[PDB]
Structure formats: structure tokens, C-alpha cells
Design a protein that fits this description.
Number of strands: 16
Number of helices: 11
CATH superfamily of one domain: Pleckstrin-homology domain (PH domain)/Phosphotyrosine-binding domain (PTB)
Keywords: Integrin Binding, Multi-domain containing protein, signaling protein
Entry title: Structural basis of kindlin-mediated integrin recognition and activation
PDB class: signaling protein
Assembly: monomeric
Order of helices and strands: EEHEEEEEHEHHEHHHHHEEEEEEEHH
Name: Fermitin family homolog 2
């Protein structure tokens, strides 16, 4: 900082790996820096996607009419001039990777909205991006389910986790109110695109073939990898449904589009009623199946039981699903998943009053739960419908939720879990407003003040 009020600002151009220095004052505008930068470099290059980034303060400087002073920029500031759009790999719930070049300066809520728009997935507010602890798009392909490649694959990615370790993964949910650039996400990193909240608004087969498919896939993989538990009976039905879904997905039909439902009798191989005998319903529409349990159930079932027996059990369950349309079957899979005892709870490591060890705070669409970190058993439950407000003490990382009856719930998390938990609470409140909404357009402003307005 010179006596004449001027100083030299250093700017690193990221895709050129050149450093540029400019003499400025506090009254120089952001846009003035940009123009001087482009002028000084003197290169026949398209700069129009480049923006100023301030690493130390983790903030983009996008308002060209603001002075350096207003931005709080002083003599010791090191800036970058960098493309706003950068490569990102998204792993979808169907476990496939899609490459996208997204705006690293947009708030993640907006990025997720734009991603979901181009993938034809309604209600982006239900999904988000999660840090990990390549499919080429074809028309409507994101609606098309595929069976797992081989039982060998499934076995290798089957690595059962203690609940405590599953809970720690939830530290990775991105802050929906900040950009990718601000959250240590690097170019070409892989992030998971996942259904984050377990309240699915207006799941409608007419419009939601891709949405329903990816939700079904999320459920299917959670079950096959035993991230959520079900009974034997339930597993055999999940297996029968996947079998039916897989068969319809790959059998050629009269339908010209992937983004659409498929009836059993529309399948090219389907036999019409009365075709084999004037006695309809005497023999099934699909006369032959090739049920093989090896890709239909979790590998634990294979260890436990002979495949002959599992085959028989799946065929028994299959009798109930043989007439379902493709999307009907996916919906029934999702509904069975929704009915599971542990469905829809997101767990965080937390400490509670009286506790001698780490426990879990469970968050569901309608309730908060104090839970045992080893068994996952509910110790105590508080209902969102009674919630008045909550507090976060950022110094001791304590969340305090105030209910009617002057009931109070307090718990302590890591700093990162506090931020994630806070957004989950605001987020579920935001989702609960959708039924009454007379506007019907996504209300991102209400989401933003519910999760980062204070």
C-alpha cells in the first residue's frame, strides 16, 4: 500500500498459467481490473467466460461495477482470473458417470436445478451433490434401467459399513448456498448426484420417466449393497420387480421412445390373448422367464442359500408383478422401499446430554431422532410439526431445536456436520411448503432464506 494510495494487485490466469500485475487503488472497479487484465495480456483469446476469483476469501467477484474497496480487497490480495465453467463428472444414482461442464460460480442449488433441467428431472430441490468418501447421452437413455453388469462387479462393490461410518459420509453434502469453487471441488472431480431428501412431490409417470428411473435405481443399489435393510420376503419381491423391470427394459417393443412407459403386451415377443388357446389367462402372457438370482439379490443371500431355492422364491414373488407396466413396477419398487423401517433417515454423528459416547442424530422429513450409533435404534423422537425455531451456536457447534410445550433438543456435531444438518432442517421445511404453493414455480428465494437467511 503506497503513500499515493496505489498498490500492485497480482492476478493469476489459471488456464494460461501466467501472472499479471496491475497498479490499482481502492476506487478501481472490478470490471476495470478485468479490462486492464485483458488489455495487458494482449492475446487473441476469448475471455468472456473468465471471472475474478479470490481464493483466500473463497469468493467470486462477479459484480463489475463494484469498487475494490466495496469488495474489501486490499494491497495483500491475490486473485485468479479463471473460466467460470469447468468440467465435472457426475455419478448418477444408476452408478453411471456423465461429464458436464458446469458453472463453478453458480450457487449449487442453481447448478443442481440446471443439471436436472437438462436431464429432464423435475423437482431438483429433492436432489443435491454429495462428495465421494462414462455414459454418453442418447435420447431418453437416463430413463432406461440396466441390470448390474455381473455378479462379480456387485460382489466387489459390496463393502458393508458400520452405521457410524455411513453417517460420516453425510459430511459430504454440498452447501446449496455456495458455488462449487468455494467447497474444494476440483475440475473433473466426480461428485454423486443423489436424491437427498426423502419426500418426493408429485411422482408422475406421465412426465417423470427419468426421475422415476433414477429414484428406482437409487433404491435398488441401496438394497443390493445393503445400505438399507429389508426382510427375506421383501428382498424376493425386490428381486422379482427388478427382474420384470430388466426384461421390459431390454425387450424390443412398439414404443419409439425411451422416455415412456412399456406395457407387457406391447413387447414384440408378447403373445396376444386367445392366441395359444381360446382359454385366455390359462397360460401367462410371458410364457417363459430366465430368472437368475445372481444379479437380483444382495450377495449375502447367495452366501446363505442355494440358487435353486432363491430362484424358486423369486418366481413365487414374480407371480404378483407379471402384469405390471415398466413404470408401474418401478413405482411399486419405490413404494416397497418407502415402507422399510429405516427408510428416509439421514444420520449424523452427534453428542447428546447424558451421553458418554458418539450417538447419531437422524433426520427424516417429519422428525428428528436421537439414535444409537451401533444398532441404529431410536432412543427418542421429536416431530417437526411441533418445531418453533432452532439455534446454531457456531462456537461450540451446538444445534438447539425449540418445540412447542417449550420442549428443547440440543446436540453437538463437528463444524461441517452442523452446516449440513442446518441445511437439511431448513430444506425439509422448504419441501413441506410445496403442497400449499399457489405459484408452482420453484421458489429458490424461500429455499435460500430457509437454509441461509438466519
Amino acid at each position: 500500500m503506497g503513500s499515493d494510495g496505489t498498490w500492485e494487485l497480482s492476478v493469476h490466469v489459471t488456464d494460461l498459467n501466467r501472472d499479471v500485475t496491475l497498479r490499482v487503488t481502492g476506487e478501481v472497479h472490478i470490471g476495470g481490473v478485468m479490462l486492464k487484465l485483458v488489455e495487458k495480456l494482449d492475446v487473441k483469446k476469448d475471455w468472456s467466460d473468465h471471472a475474478l476469483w479470490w481464493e483466500k476469501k473463497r469468493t467470486w467477484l462477479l459484480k463489475t461495477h463494484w469498487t475494490l474497496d466495496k469488495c474489501g480487497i486490499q494491497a495483500d490480495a491475490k486473485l485468479q482470473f479463471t473460466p467460470q465453467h469447468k468440467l465435472l463428472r457426475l455419478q448418477l444414482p444408476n452408478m453411471k458417470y456423465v461429464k458436464v461442464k458446469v458453472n463453478f460460480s453458480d450457487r449449487v442449488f442453481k447448478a443442481v436445478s440446471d443439471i436436472c433441467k437438462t436431464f429432464n428431472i423435475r423437482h431438483p430441490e429433492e436432489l443435491s451433490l454429495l462428495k465421494k468418501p462414462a455414459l454418453e447421452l442418447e435420447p431418453g437413455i437416463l430413463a432406461v434401467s440396466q441390470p448390474v453388469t455381473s455378479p462379480e462387479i456387485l460382489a466387489k462393490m459390496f463393502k458393508p459399513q458400520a452405521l457410524l461410518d455411513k453417517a460420516k459420509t453425510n459430511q459430504g453434502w454440498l452447501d446449496s448456498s455456495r458455488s462449487l469453487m468455494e467447497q474444494d471441488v476440483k475440475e473433473n472431480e466426480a461428485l454423486l448426484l443423489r436424491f437427498k431428501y426423502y419426500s418426493f412431490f408429485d411422482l408422475n409417470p406421465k412426465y417423470d420417466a427419468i426421475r422415476i428411473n433414477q429414484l428406482y435405481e437409487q433404491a435398488k443399489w441401496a438394497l443390493l449393497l445393503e445400505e438399507i435393510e429389508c426382510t427375506e420376503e421383501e428382498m424376493m419381491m425386490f428381486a422379482a420387480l427388478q427382474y420384470h423391470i430388466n426384461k421390459l427394459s431390454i425387450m424390443t417393443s412398439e414404443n419409439h421412445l425411451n422416455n415412456s412407459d412399456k406395457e407387457v403386451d406391447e413387447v414384440d415377443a408378447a403373445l396376444s390373448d386367445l392366441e395359444i388357446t381360446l382359454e385366455g389367462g390359462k397360460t401367462s402372457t410371458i410364457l417363459t422367464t430366465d430368472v437368475n438370482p445372481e444379479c437380483l439379490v444382495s450377495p449375502r443371500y447367495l452366501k446363505k442359500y442355494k440358487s435353486k431355492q432363491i430362484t424358486a422364491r423369486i418366481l413365487e414373488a414374480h407371480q404378483n408383478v407379471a402384469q405390471m407396466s415398466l413404470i408401474e413396477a418401478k413405482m411399486r419398487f419405490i413404494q416397497a422401499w418407502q415402507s422399510l423401517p429405516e427408510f428416509g433417515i439421514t444420520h449424523f454423528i452427534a453428542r447428546f446430554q447424558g451421553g458418554k459416547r458418539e450417538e447419531l442424530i437422524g433426520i427424516a422429513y417429519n422428525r428428528l431422532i436421537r439414535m444409537d450409533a451401533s444398532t441404529g435404534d431410536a432412543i427418542k423422537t421429536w416431530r417437526f410439526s411441533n418445531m418453533k425455531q432452532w439455534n446454531v451456536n457456531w462456537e461450540i457447534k451446538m444445534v438447539t431445536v425449540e418445540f412447542a410445550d417449550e420442549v428443547r433438543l440440543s446436540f453437538i456435531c463437528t463444524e461441517v456436520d452442523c452446516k449440513v444438518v442446518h441445511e437439511f432442517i431448513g430444506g425439509y421445511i422448504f419441501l413441506s411448503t410445496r403442497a400449499k404453493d399457489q405459484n408452482e414455480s420453484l421458489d429458490e428465494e424461500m429455499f435460500y432464506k430457509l437454509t441461509s437467511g438466519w
